[PDB]
């Protein structure tokens, strides 16, 4: 149901959930990331969503199951809104810095700026939705 590219992209997303890198996702890790991006799911809602896809019934989520566990544009647009924390249509360095730190990424301000810069096609020191999608696929 997904192309090879998108599967490859979700694999790196998976890695952000898989903090300790043993290749599976626990309930604790699952909520951690979701909470870090502002979501507030219940321990029951996590466990129930896991159990639905927990095919081999070991209690953790592997990558194949993470895929099955996962209108299209509105998610992409909502993902864009995760970064733009004041909704001004533009993602700023300080706002990229926010998301990065919530996620657990370690970098300097110049590095944040350089990410903004590399994503910026027009040239204004902040990133919009047009290039956000162009960066999301490359």
């Amino acid at each position: 149901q997904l192309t090879e590219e998108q599967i490859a992209e979700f694999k790196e997303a998976f890695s952000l959930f898989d903090k300790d890198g043993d290749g599976t996702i626990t309930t604790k890790e699952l909520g951690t990331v979701m909470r870090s991006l502002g979501q507030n799911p219940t321990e029951a809602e996590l466990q129930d969503m896991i159990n639905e896809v927990d095919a081999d019934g070991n209690g953790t989520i592997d990558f194949p199951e993470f895929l099955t566990m996962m209108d299209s544009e509105e998610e992409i647009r909502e993902a864009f809104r995760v970064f733009d924390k004041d909704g001004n249509g533009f993602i700023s360095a300080a706002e990229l810095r926010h998301v990065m730190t919530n996620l657990g990424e370690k970098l300097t301000d110049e590095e944040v700026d350089e990410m903004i810069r590399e994503a910026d096609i027009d040239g204004d020191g902040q990133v919009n939705y047009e290039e956000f999608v162009t960066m999301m696929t490359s």
Binding site: E9, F10, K11, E12, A13, F14, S15, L16, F17, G21, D22, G23, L30, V33, M34, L37, Q39, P41, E45, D48, M49, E52, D56, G57, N58, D62, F63, M69, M70, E75, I76, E78, A79, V82, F83, V99, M100, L103, G104, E105, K106, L107, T108, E111, E114, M115, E118, A119, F132, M135, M136, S138
Partner: protein, 791 residues
């Protein structure tokens, strides 16, 4: 180019050296420890070495070169730090420390291993037990833990650690554990014996099962047993003994028991007196043995020495153990009576007439008949005659009596002895099993202990059978490792990877194929007018003249085989190496059949106990049949593997004998497994390990990355070929020696590396964007999935 290599060394196994010249099939090696003492080495016995001689890895798959020499060295380094456990992937290597390390078997260590994936904790027997348990619980599948090792290689302790772990973690504690352990002196008395190399060698296959209910809680235990060595019951070489029970009884029994059973020193019994008739004893225990129990050999040479074994003391301990499992004195004397019955049976002789019992055998006959609850005349008749029908294909026939020749009477006598002792052994095991019974169970986790692959200067039918058994176990080991590796590669998303697998099915078929296998050709020899070992041997060579796994003895490189005629032996190319078998006596050792009238006799003993023991196939084929039953059981389970290693022959601590350990690594099939793994990706390292190894060479920009993304950036920057290097889900995987090549790339040209890293910058920046971007999209989908499920 100047790199250290491992080359053969007669006591360390391998030594470090440099290659200073080459030849058509050899290399000239200069040992690092000698300025010019160069020596020649076959090319295939020289291996690349890790540059860091102080490296210590928990999984030998982390090595840059995975081979027998680097494995040997890694476990040596680990053993020097008292780290006795090391993995090869999921295989556990366990070197006997020969001292107590309580720290690592404590209740807290047990608890620390519960629910932990193998590799999230230091290597340990407990991780193997826990993996077996989790797979059992999850997959609804019984498990086997298959342990190899020489007698005394720490196997008994290793089995106890598994049992301790399983009962404490997943049962009600010490109860089942103690019952299984306390019964062991009984099993050892009837199933263990002194061999040339080992004072306390187990002569049967033992599979100790812990049974669980549907809730995966322990309900009980069961000892399955296979392949008790029958030939030892009647005869032994001069440095070996019959089963321990015979000597424990002779040395230890009270004078009243001695009189009732008509015992005397072992030199008085044929079933003992070809072997070593000396007792295990020390200065003190020797004083407790009455002089009338001591053979001339014992009196002349003194006792056999052992720190643990003692025939007089072990008799006492065995008795204690029998009480400890509720075996009353009546059943105990029933056991001893059958044992002595067997001993007296063996003393009976015959002489040409058919044949008759010799007159001097009259006492032996009387004692045998009394102890076994048989009529003397009936026994005399059934030992010297047999019954036959006058037809074979369905025409009206009648029963006739057929006198036996002396040699057939000898056979009938020994056949009866073997079947009686074997049924008695069966009874002991069943009795032991009655100490931890259970009504029902869903699954089990079992630990296998059986004699491993072996060879000596002279290899006979006994070694042939043992090595056959091991050849089949190695095939099982290989299949399961092959399957685990292919599954691991799939789980890591490595793509399409056919692993090249050289089966040993051809060696197995050489031995056991119907009609044309060695065992069936041996059976066929029985059918000829004048059976001979030489004709059997010629037939093997004739039938298999083109076989890769078979050679005449002359082809051996060893000098001791050079004069062995083609019809006097053959060489099998086993998984662990070539073994030359001398075939003298193969025909006779292939026969142990008990003719019907004599079997009926014992089956209907006057004695209830003997009857309850009992309530045309060759030795080789019974062996094949029983072995196959063992394999059926193993094949129905998930399997895990432990290789127990004996570090030296002196039971000493802190003493790594390299060549002895190398030989065990080969005989245990570990080298066969490594050869197998070369067809896949035998080296691999987690992103974390690679990160810690190489971040020092990277700019600070890269060092702040999480380990996976660090490794992605590095892997991408270098442009490695996609055949040799595979980026997995949790590890980077390497074709053989390619981790070493990767290491050389990382060190060899800093300016090239720096530019390659600079050039990867754009890709790295996008990858990191896409990571957090697709993660946010993921969080949104999980958010939506909750809402979706709620509608």
């Amino acid at each position: 180019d100047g790199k250290p290599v491992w080359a053969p060394h007669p006591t360390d196994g391998f030594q470090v050296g440099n290659i200073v010249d080459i030849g058509p099939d050899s290399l000239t090696i200069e040992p690092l420890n000698q300025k010019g003492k160069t020596f020649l080495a076959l090319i295939n016995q020289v291996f690349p070495a890790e540059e860091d001689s102080k490296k210590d890895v928990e999984d030998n798959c982390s090595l840059m070169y995975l081979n027998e020499a680097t494995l040997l060295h890694n476990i040596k380094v680990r053993y020097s730090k008292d780290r006795i456990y090391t993995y090869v992937a999921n295989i556990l290597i366990a070197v006997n420390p020969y001292f107590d390390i309580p720290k690592i078997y404590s209740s807290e260590t047990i608890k620390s291993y519960q629910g932990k994936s193998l590799g999230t904790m230091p290597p340990h027997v407990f991780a193997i037990a826990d993996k077996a348990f989790r797979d059992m619980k999850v997959l609804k599948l019984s498990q086997s833990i298959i342990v190899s090792g020489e007698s005394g290689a720490g196997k008994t302790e290793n089995t106890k650690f598994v049992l301790r772990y399983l009962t404490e973690s997943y049962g009600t504690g010490q109860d089942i554990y103690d019952r299984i352990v306390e019964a062991n002196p009984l099993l050892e008395a009837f199933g263990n014996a002194k061999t040339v190399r080992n004072n306390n060698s187990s002569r049967f296959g033992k599979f100790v099962e812990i049974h669980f209910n549907e809730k995966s809680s322990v309900v009980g235990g069961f000892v399955s047993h296979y392949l008790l060595e029958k030939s030892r019951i009647c005869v032994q070489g001069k440095e070996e003994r019959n089963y321990h029970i015979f000597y424990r009884l002779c040395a230890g029994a009270s004078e009243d028991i001695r009189e009732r059973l008509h015992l005397s020193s072992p030199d008085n019994f044929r079933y003992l007196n070809r072997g070593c008739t000396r007792y295990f004893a020390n200065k003190e225990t020797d004083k407790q043995i009455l002089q009338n129990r001591k053979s001339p050999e014992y009196l002349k040479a003194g006792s056999l020495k052992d720190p643990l074994l003692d025939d007089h003391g072990d008799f006492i301990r065995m008795c204690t153990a029998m009480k400890k499992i509720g075996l009353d004195d009546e059943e105990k004397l029933d056991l001893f009576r059958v044992v002595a019955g067997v001993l007296h049976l063996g003393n009976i002789d015959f002489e040409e007439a058919g044949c008759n019992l010799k007159n001097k055998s009259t006492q032996a006959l009387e004692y045998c008949a009394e102890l076994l609850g048989l009529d003397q005349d009936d026994l005399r008749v059934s030992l010297t005659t047999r019954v036959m029908l006058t037809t074979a294909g369905g025409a009206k026939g009648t029963v006739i009596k057929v006198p036996l020749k002396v040699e057939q009477a000898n056979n009938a006598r020994d056949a009866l002895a073997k079947t009686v002792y074997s049924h008695l052994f069966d009874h002991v095991v069943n009795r032991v099993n009655q100490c931890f019974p259970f009504e029902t169970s869903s699954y089990f986790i079992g630990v296998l202990d059986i004699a491993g692959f072996e060879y000596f200067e002279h290899n006979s039918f006994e070694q042939f059978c043992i090595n056959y058994c091991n050849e089949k176990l190695q095939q099982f080991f290989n299949e399961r490792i092959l399957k685990e590796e292919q599954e691991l590669y799939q789980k890591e998303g490595l793509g399409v990877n056919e692993v090249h697998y050289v089966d040993n099915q051809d060696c197995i078929d050489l031995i056991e194929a119907r009609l044309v296998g060695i065992l069936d050709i041996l059976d066929e020899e029985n059918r000829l007018p004048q059976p001979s070992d030489q004709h059997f041997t010629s037939a093997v060579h004739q039938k298999h003249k083109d076989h890769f796994r078979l050679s005449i003895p002359r082809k051996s490189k060893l000098a001791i085989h050079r004069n062995i005629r083609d019809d006097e032996g053959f060489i099998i190319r086993h998984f662990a190496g070539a073994v030359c078998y001398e075939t003298t006596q193969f025909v006779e050792k292939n026969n142990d059949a008990l003719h019907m009238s004599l079997e009926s006799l014992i089956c209907e003993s006057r004695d209830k106990f003997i009857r309850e023991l009992f309530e045309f196939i060759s030795v080789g084929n019974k062996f094949k049949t029983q072995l196959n039953l063992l394999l059926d059981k193993l094949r129905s389970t998930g399997a895990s593997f432990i290789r127990c290693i004996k570090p030296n022959l002196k039971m000493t601590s802190h003493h790594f004998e390299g060549a002895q350990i190398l030989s065990q690594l080969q005989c245990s099939g570990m080298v066969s497994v490594l050869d197998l793994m070369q067809g896949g990706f035998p080296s691999r390292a987690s992103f974390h390990e690679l990160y810690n190894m190489y971040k020092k060479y990277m700019p600070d920009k890269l060092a702040r990355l999480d380990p996976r993304l660090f490794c992605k950036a590095l892997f991408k920057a270098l442009g490695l070929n996609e055949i040799d290097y595979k980026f997995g889900l949790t590890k980077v995987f390497f074709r053989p020696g390619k981790f070493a090549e990767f290491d050389q790339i990382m060190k060899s040209d800093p300016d090239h590396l720096a530019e390659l890293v600079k050039r990867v910058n754009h890709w790295l920046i996008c990858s990191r964007w896409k990571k957090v971007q697709w993660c946010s999209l993921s969080v949104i989908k999980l958010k939506n999935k909750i809402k979706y499920r709620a509608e």
